[model samples]
Target chain A: NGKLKWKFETGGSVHSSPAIGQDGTIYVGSNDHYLYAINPNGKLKWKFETGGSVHSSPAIGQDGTIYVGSNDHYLYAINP
Target chain B: NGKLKWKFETGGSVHSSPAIGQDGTIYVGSNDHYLYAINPNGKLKWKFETGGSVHSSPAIGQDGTIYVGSNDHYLYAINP
Candidate 1:
């Protein structure tokens, strides 16, 4: 059995895995065409809009840029 | 087009999304029943074994613990 933490909702299905930043920011993509940055307490920090469904997981670069691919044929380099 | 930075091989296929630590270490799981920690240059730092395929993505906790799940019905908390 598992305990429920907190959940954030997106308009579409979520297939993207999450990535955690050094500051405890949780980044995840949704089919709703957005990449979300969530706080450790499960609150919304910000949302970055993309052209298509972001089915890819995010990877943070050495410079703290969040890189993720979208079905929209673009790789996003977002500021955290 | 994409350029290949580097690649690391495992005994089985890798389906798990990778998590990058603050030190740029990469953590990923494979069907080979192992979780691997890779350096930024694609070198193996370490590997932790589990009883079954680890298809779940890795999540790094605020305290620096890496959490992952396996088909073995266990959730692993690995030390970074």
Candidate 2:
């Protein structure tokens, strides 16, 4: 079993899987129509706006390209 | 507007987001404990077995590596 890590509250359920960056930053989508980036220390880094629920897990490319899908029927690519 | 494309049937709902490769292959998970890879032409390329429902979306790396999660609480990385 793994020890508990800090948790951050969101507006809605978090079905989106987390994406970790090279710097250990965590990125995840939320039903709140936001993609959040949290630092390893469990601090908020940044957030991106989306059109609808983001249940899709993020995919991190080798060059730090982030890809995710939204219920709005759009797949986004973000560079962070 | 987009034209109609062929559809493939699955045993259950397809909530898992798809990952597209350079060759236009689409990889997705299903609640059916099966991870399927479909070619762009709407043909089945292959499938991998899992222990439980695969509701998690797939992530593809640059080196043709694939990663996905399952309700079984396991994350898998596969080379295709």
Candidate 3:
């Protein structure tokens, strides 16, 4: 952990740490109710909004699917 | 849950996903450099070894003791 690259403000806190994809894309969860994918160049790729805050760290499957849980009481499997 | 038996193999890659106490033990991290603890009943006991490749998933500090890092980074602390 070094200098700050960039930071995005959220409605709540961020409990989940970042997960890097095979291609270097970064994935992380925020209590603001979204799962964000950031490109290697530090840009936003896409975001999937959920019904509740996400506190669980994401796990990427061999096929590049992302798995994470949320306070919304559900686990998500997203194709990234 | 289902039941199945397995073999234990290592030498690298276990991204840390467990944290048990004085009795039952199980810890994982990969390339198998080691950081595990199981029990007598085919379970882990306690292991701590690291040179490189630990996905970094450990957070145990109630009395301000015990922490781990990667690849001979020259950082060690002890408690209790």
Candidate 4:
């Protein structure tokens, strides 16, 4: 049966999907001016502030770099 | 130099990235209550209406079925 494992919350609307890393860390952007990293247990790992809403989704590179875009007219490369 | 080749217009804001088919058809969702299929030349190939705004990105399966979600509380499987 399909079921929900857990739910995570954000400060604003999340218009994008989450990208998972090789180690199972979940990364996603929010309209709340932040890019958040959540652990597998649904706990907040970390969050990076952005100047604008992050409607753009996150992409994880093979090297473990997390790339995301913000409405602030900048694309960011965050260390995973 | 980074240059723009072409741009396609939609009825509403596009919040998702485009998914390309094996045959070069570009698929994307729009807040316009529809999912669009665009030719490689940025022309319209077809569009499927949804019950709600489609902010979910399209995912093309190996079998050529396009999967996407709509705010209508449904995940759509579209034939390509």
Give the winner by lDDT: 1
* Model 3 fnat value: 0.00
Computed on C-alphas against the true complex, the DockQ of each candidate is: 0.09, 0.09, 0.03, 0.07
Report the Cα lDDT for residue A12, model 3: 76
Give lDDT tens digits, candidate 2, residues A4-34.
Answer: 8789987889988898889898989999987
lDDT of candidate 3 over B8-75, digit per residue (tens) = 33454333433333332333343345454433233434466677654455445665344556555633
Give the top-scoring candidate (DockQ). 1
* Candidate 3 segments whose C-alpha is farther than 4 A from its true place: B1-80
Model 4 steric clash pairs: none
Alpha-carbon local distance difference test for all models: 0.77, 0.73, 0.55, 0.75
What does candidate 1 score on TM? 0.56
TM-score of chain A of 2: 0.92
TM-score of 2: 0.56
- Kindly report which residue stretches of model 1 are placed more than 4 angstroms away from their true locations once superposed: B1-58, B64-80
- Any runs in candidate 2 off by more than 4 Å, and if so which? B1-15, B18-80
